[PDB]
Design an enzyme around this catalytic site. Structure first.
Site, PDB file in Angstrom:
ATOM      1  N   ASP A  70       8.318   6.647  15.361  1.00  0.00           N
ATOM      2  CA  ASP A  70       8.405   7.757  15.198  1.00  0.00           C
ATOM      3  C   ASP A  70       9.014   8.648  16.768  1.00  0.00           C
ATOM      4  O   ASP A  70       7.947   8.340  17.468  1.00  0.00           O
ATOM      5  CB  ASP A  70       6.850   7.903  15.277  1.00  0.00           C
ATOM      6  CG  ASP A  70       6.780   9.642  14.170  1.00  0.00           C
ATOM      7  OD1 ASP A  70       7.750  10.455  14.239  1.00  0.00           O
ATOM      8  OD2 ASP A  70       6.159  10.277  13.823  1.00  0.00           O
ATOM      9  N   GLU A  93       0.537  -1.305  -0.373  1.00  0.00           N
ATOM     10  CA  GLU A  93      -0.269   0.012   0.215  1.00  0.00           C
ATOM     11  C   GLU A  93       0.823   1.317  -0.062  1.00  0.00           C
ATOM     12  O   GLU A  93       2.036   1.275   0.774  1.00  0.00           O
ATOM     13  CB  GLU A  93      -0.858   0.102   1.396  1.00  0.00           C
ATOM     14  CG  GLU A  93      -1.800   1.636   1.277  1.00  0.00           C
ATOM     15  CD  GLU A  93      -2.985   1.018   2.785  1.00  0.00           C
ATOM     16  OE1 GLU A  93      -2.722   0.806   3.172  1.00  0.00           O
ATOM     17  OE2 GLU A  93      -3.480   1.693   2.831  1.00  0.00           O
ATOM     18  N   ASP A 149       9.638  13.016  18.031  1.00  0.00           N
ATOM     19  CA  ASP A 149       8.641  13.896  16.862  1.00  0.00           C
ATOM     20  C   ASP A 149       9.335  14.802  18.377  1.00  0.00           C
ATOM     21  O   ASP A 149       8.002  14.481  19.373  1.00  0.00           O
ATOM     22  CB  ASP A 149       7.206  14.181  16.993  1.00  0.00           C
ATOM     23  CG  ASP A 149       7.341  13.733  15.525  1.00  0.00           C
ATOM     24  OD1 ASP A 149       7.660  14.478  14.762  1.00  0.00           O
ATOM     25  OD2 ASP A 149       5.713  13.750  14.881  1.00  0.00           O
TER      26      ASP A 149
END
Ligand SMILES: [Zn+2]
Ligand SMILES: [Zn+2]
Ligand SMILES: [Zn+2]
Lengths: 249, 182, 431, 381
Positions: free
Chosen positions: D106, D41, D108
């Site tokens: 992730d 995808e 951040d």
């Protein structure tokens, strides 16, 4: 081993893999079915009321198992006839309830849950020796780190296992398992991970065992639901199995 | 509720005794049904004539088995109600097609469930342990779980053995677990 | 009283075959080999669970009975094609079916229906009009092949009724060529007088057995009759099993001097045994170690092999059951016996009589006649007889006791390969 | 950088700079598993924030085509499904399942806002980037030692943080439960904005926590005591006081009134805590609360998570999401990362080697080395 016994029931705990092949009476069928239904309902009620690790849970579950005469404690004596009888009960009753609890997904889930709970309790009551015996009889083959590697990671192992003393730790041997099987242990960081393997002492192991058990049991229930038409034709067992879930005990 | 109760005629007085439970009476006045005759003026104890009770039980079992194997069929249609002994080979999805009206199913007058329930009831009216656990109350259970009733308990066990033996030979007393689990 | 003072003791009421001396003697079961006829089908030797009959199973059993007999008859007669019974037929067609009565009463010529099998007729029935049939003999449950026409689609009119085809006799092996002739004494219950439970007639018969020393003694039930006046009204002070055990002990122990192989056949009137047909053998008595090889608890019906001689026997009163239902255009017992032999079943009547409980799976498995027996023992309430039906010696010895008066038994001599004269001589004699 | 200039530059980059060959090498994983690249995808974000997913492609040529045609502003990589996403409408309900995906993290900077003093929100500076520098070392070490994951690609997110792609075949077959277990094992700083004390270590320090504290210590003095100056004035050291038991707080305050340097204040705090023993780990809890990485378990738990593709262009900073070399981590500078405008200026100043003439080359080189390692592992195995 009085008259018609054998090595068919080595250990108390079992995965319920091999169906029974005996010819039993209708009275025995009904008695076993109802008794195990009582046991499972007691398990469910105690699970709702108490925390499964609580001592009240253990005491009440032991009382229920004694009252209904199901195997719950080991015996380092031999396979006494009475013990054999109890184990036979357990083995047959389980499969009978399978026949009772495979018609609807809801029922299936309920059955699985109760069975898992019971199994966990029984495992919690197994001495290390007995535990190993069980792990061998079912070809689970859980051991085993070398002594040299153990000394190599001595400090890491000491800080990994909660409440493990230096000498007592020297007296213990660990096992190497892929971390995908120790999820419940790794997730709260109670077992050391090195190079993708967890070093599990001889609390978490029950989890892996249970996982295996659950897999098997689900498969079995599916198969039973697939083999339902053969049983519905037996009127004798239809009133019971079709309505066991709604049986007053 | 649809099963015939056990009728036994007293050898002494000849009065019918209907048995539908192991125990008769309430409280400390409760005793096994076969201990005293239903006629107050009669002192005969049916437990004395337990050979006769056994024989009557066997005769009743034979009567019910004969009723079942008579194979009487009745049409389910109210406006037909055809009664025949002959089972026709012409079947619908629901069962034999009545040959009088050709539009309704023939149902057994005495199905297998009826005979099974009758035998189970005859076992029930002689099940000492089950009556003590389920039917009987607490004080009554205490009064019945003593001596002075051991002989009655043994005779009731012997009488239940007969119905158990008969049921063991019914395909509707043995369960073949091999056929169930494969 | 009446029985004990009888004057016709030992009278030969019926005779057949070679004339023999006034006294009969046997080999005491010395050179005797008694077994169950070894056919393709296994025999009934143990109890089978009963009281659970599905209507579908009864349908299947009846249908396969009709189909199998019709297949054998079609091969024998070289019939081309069978036609559905129910369909209309303007021209002559051959139809296979079974006879029945359109109502619950007794069959008559105006109440005959033919029910076809599932394969050729979907189980459909059709009324039968016997006006164009010159000669016939029909009983309910009889598998028949008929040529006829159905012009209205509502009434079958037979024009030909195919005859029955009995099974071939047994071709004995030479293993028993050198064995001597064997003596068989056969008696049927009741064994006690209507007003007594002492088994006086049985004692007389046991004395006769020890006197004549037969090779086989075939005793057919009932041994504890359910219709005995004492049994029905509950006047017995001992359990049924105890009385039956006493009777069997009397029989077995009393025959010790004779050394005679005893063949015990149960009856539907045995109040102590399972009321189901085919009846399993008795299993409540364990003979002593010295009588195990002599006593044979067989099933009802039974096909026995005695030195190669095949004896068929049934305790059920077949002749009384079928005589009440057989209809003929014009000896009645010979006709019924031929019907039994040609249908190849020990109980071809359907629906049965009111006095017999039939488990149809067991009936299918254990009532086929393997071959046509050399001797066929058929006790009946009807009069005693010794008939020759299609080469089979059908013996009705009556019943040992007829109410308050003594009855009769039978004695016959059998040798394999004699002359087909496997039955040398036979006699119905008084007790 | 002018973001109105984004629509002008995006095509050229996607035409002559985006490393499609290596990108296909990566997502194709040596062709071992059939339909692996074909069941991947993708999702695109186009102009005016138009989002499309269930995009799949037959091979490198189709991808190059449809990408150069759409000119997307954002490219996210998603799971490998049981069938091709493009035909998800054609797959019977319940039979469309995400089956494999890299294990991704992730980190951040915005999640560190309650504990940094130099910047806020999306602002970053050289004084706070050391936090990322710590995270990459703390996490990557675990992933290389505790779990044995061997192929790990660290990528700059473009603005506020860094992503990690763990691409070992074992890591790509991990269930949701196993991923959640991995995330929770690595996660220490638990709690929201409503909690003050976010780290409560037990008496026993798990080896992983010991090694994370060892890594933290090397940097702590520079990051917290020199650069961040977490004890500069009362408004800030009141927090750290708020993170320790009240019993010694007063004792500390007077001491903090006589200290001139935050290094001195740290020495004083350590001495006071040592004097005060169950609290001997409190300084470690403070260090972790100021230095340990924060992980959004929702990012790593779900298999169907779409994460920013490497070599993407940040819609606002314009920087390229470039891989970070683990060895040269200490030299990494998020402000020198090539922007799209710089690399288009470089491109229009001079076929398969055009990118070697831009400042993008060393980062494609690091990516090529990582892919070479993956190929070696695929072969050797
Ligand atoms: Zn009375
Ligand atoms: Zn009708
Ligand atoms: Zn900053």
């Amino acid at each position: 081993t009085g008259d018609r016994k054998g090595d068919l029931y080595p250990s108390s705990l079992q995965f319920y893999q091999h169906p029974p092949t005996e010819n039993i009476s209708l009275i025995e069928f009904e008695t076993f079915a109802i008794e195990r239904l009582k046991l499972l309902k007691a398990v469910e009620n105690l699970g709702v009321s108490y925390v499964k690790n609580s001592e009240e849970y253990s005491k009440k579950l032991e009382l229920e198992l004694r009252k209904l005469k199901f195997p719950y404690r080991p015996l380092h004596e031999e396979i006494s006839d009475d013990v054999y009888d109890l184990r036979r009960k357990d083995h047959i009753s389980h499969f009978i309830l399978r026949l009772a609890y495979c018609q609807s997904e809801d029922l299936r889930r309920w059955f699985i849950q109760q069975e898992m709970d019971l199994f966990k309790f029984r495992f919690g009551l197994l001495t290390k020796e007995s535990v190993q015996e069980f792990l061998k009889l079912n070809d689970l083959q859980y051991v085993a780190i070398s002594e040299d590697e153990k000394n190599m990671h001595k400090e890491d192992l000491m800080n990994s296992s909660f409440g493990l003393s230096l000498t007592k730790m020297e007296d213990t041997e660990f096992y190497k398992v892929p971390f995908q099987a120790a999820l419940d242990l790794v997730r709260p960081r109670k077992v050391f991970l090195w190079r993708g393997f967890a070093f599990i002492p001889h609390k978490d192991i029950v989890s892996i065992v249970l996982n295996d058990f659950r897999a098997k049991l689900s498969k079995a229930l599916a198969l039973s639901a697939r083999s339902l038409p053969v049983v519905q034709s037996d009127e004798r067992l239809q009133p019971l199995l079709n309505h066991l879930s709604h049986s007053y005990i | 509720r649809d099963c015939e109760r056990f009728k036994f005629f007293c050898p002494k007085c000849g009065t019918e005794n209907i048995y539908d439970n192991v125990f008769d009476g309430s409280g400390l006045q409760i005793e096994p049904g076969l201990k005293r005759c239903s006629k107050p003026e009669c002192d005969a104890s049916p437990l004395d004539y337990v050979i006769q009770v056994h024989n009557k039980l066997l005769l009743d079992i034979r009567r019910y088995i004969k009723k079942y194997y008579s194979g009487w069929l009745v049409c389910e249609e109210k406006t037909c109600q055809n009664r025949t002994r002959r089972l026709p080979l012409s079947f619908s999805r629901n069962g034999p097609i009545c040959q009088a009206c050709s539009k309704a199913t023939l149902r057994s007058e005495y199905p297998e469930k009826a005979l099974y329930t009758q035998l189970c009831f005859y076992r029930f009216i002689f099940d000492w342990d089950y009556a003590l656990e389920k039917v009987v109350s607490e004080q009554e259970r205490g009064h019945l779980k003593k001596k002075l009733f051991q002989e009655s308990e043994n005779q009731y066990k012997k009488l239940k053995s007969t119905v158990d033996q008969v049921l063991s030979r019914s395909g509707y007393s043995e369960v073949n677990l091999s056929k169930l689990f494969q | 009283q009446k029985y004990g003072s009888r004057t016709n003791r030992g009278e030969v009421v019926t005779t057949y075959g070679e004339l023999q001396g006034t006294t009969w003697n046997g080999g005491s079961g010395s050179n005797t080999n008694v077994e169950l006829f070894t056919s393709l089908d296994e025999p009934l030797t143990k109890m089978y669970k009963f009281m659970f009959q599905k209507l579908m199973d009864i349908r299947e059993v009846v249908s396969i009975k009709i189909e199998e007999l019709g297949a054998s008859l079609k091969d024998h007669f070289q019939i081309d094609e069978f036609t559905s019974v129910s369909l209309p037929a303007q021209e002559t067609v051959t139809v296979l079916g079974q006879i029945g009565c359109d109502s619950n009463g007794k069959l008559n010529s105006k109440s005959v229906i033919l029910e076809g099998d599932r394969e050729h007729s979907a189980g459909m029935q059709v009324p039968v009009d016997l006006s164009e049939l010159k000669d016939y003999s029909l009983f309910p449950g009889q598998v028949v092949i008929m040529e006829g026409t159905n012009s209205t689609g509502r009434r079958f009119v037979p024009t030909k009724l195919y005859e029955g085809v009995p099974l071939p006799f047994h071709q004995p092996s030479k293993e028993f060529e050198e064995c001597p002739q064997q003596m068989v004494i056969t008696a049927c219950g009741p064994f006690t007088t209507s007003d007594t439970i002492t088994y006086d007639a049985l004692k007389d018969l046991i004395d006769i057995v020890n006197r004549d020393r037969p090779d086989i003694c075939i005793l057919l039930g009932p041994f504890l009759d359910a219709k005995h006046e004492q049994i029905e009204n509950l006047q017995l002070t001992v359990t049924f099993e105890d009385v039956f055990k006493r009777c069997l002990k009397m029989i077995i122990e009393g025959t010790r001097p004779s050394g005679c192989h005893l063949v015990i056949v149960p009856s539907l009137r045995d109040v102590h045994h399972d009321p189901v047909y085919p009846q399993p053998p008795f299993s409540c008595f364990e003979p002593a170690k010295e009588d195990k090889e002599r006593v044979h608890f067989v099933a009802d019906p039974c096909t026995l092999s005695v030195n190669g001689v095949v004896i068929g026997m049934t305790s059920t009163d077949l002749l009384f059951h079928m005589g009440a239902e057989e209809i003929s255009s014009s000896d009645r017992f010979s006709r019924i016996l031929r019907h039994i032999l040609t249908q190849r079943s020990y109980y071809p009547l359907y629906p049965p009589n009111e006095e017999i409980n039939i488990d149809y799976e067991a009936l299918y498995s254990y009532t086929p006649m393997p071959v046509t027996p050399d001797v066929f023992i058929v006790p009946s309430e009807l009069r005693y007889f010794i008939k020759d039906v299609t080469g089979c010696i059908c013996i009705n010895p009556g019943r040992l006791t007829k109410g308050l008066v003594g009855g009769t038994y039978a004695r016959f001599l059998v040798k394999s390969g004699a002359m087909r004269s496997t039955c040398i001589s036979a006699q119905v004699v008084r007790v | 950088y002018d973001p109105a200039s984004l629509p002008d530059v995006l095509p050229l980059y996607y035409r002559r700079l985006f490393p499609f060959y290596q990108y296909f090498r990566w997502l194709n994983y040596g062709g071992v598993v059939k339909n692996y690249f074909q069941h991947r995808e993708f999702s695109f974000t186009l102009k005016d924030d138009v989002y499309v997913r269930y995009q799949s492609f037959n091979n490198q040529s189709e991808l190059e085509k449809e990408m150069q045609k759409m000119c997307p502003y954002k490219i996210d990589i998603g799971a490998v499904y049981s069938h091709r996403p493009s035909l998800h409408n054609t797959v019977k309900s319940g039979t469309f399942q995400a089956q494999e995906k890299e294990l991704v993290f992730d980190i951040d900077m915005t999640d560190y806002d309650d504990v940094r003093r130099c910047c806020s929100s999306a602002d970053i500076c050289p004084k706070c980037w050391t936090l990322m520098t710590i995270a990459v070392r703390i996490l990557d070490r675990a992933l290389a030692e505790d779990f044995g994951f061997k192929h790990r690609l660290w990528v700059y997110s473009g603005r506020r943080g860094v992503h990690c792609w763990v691409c070992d075949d074992s890591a790509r077959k991990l269930s949701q439960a196993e991923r959640s277990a991995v995330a929770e094992y690595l996660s220490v700083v638990k709690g929201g904005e409503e909690t003050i004390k976010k780290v409560q270590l037990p008496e026993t320090i798990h080896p992983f926590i010991g090694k994370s504290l060892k890594m933290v210590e090397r940097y702590f003095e520079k990051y917290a005591l020199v650069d961040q100056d977490i004890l500069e004035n009362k408004q800030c050291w009141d927090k750290v006081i708020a993170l320790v038991p009240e019993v010694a707080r007063e004792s500390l305050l007077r001491e903090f009134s006589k200290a001139r340097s935050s290094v001195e204040r740290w020495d004083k705090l350590s001495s006071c805590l040592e004097a005060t023993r169950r609290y001997s780990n409190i300084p470690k809890e403070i260090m972790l609360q100021f230095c340990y990485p924060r992980l959004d378990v929702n990012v790593s738990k779900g298999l169907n998570h779409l994460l920013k593709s490497p070599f993407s262009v940040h819609p606002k900073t314009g920087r390229i999401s470039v891989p970070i070399d683990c060895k040269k981590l200490d030299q990494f500078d998020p402000f020198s990362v090539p922007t799209i405008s710089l690399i288009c200026s470089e491109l229009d100043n001079v076929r398969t080697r055009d990118y070697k003439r831009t400042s993008l080359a060393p980062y494609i080189k690091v990516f090529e080395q990582f892919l070479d390692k993956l190929d070696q592992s695929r072969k050797g195995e």
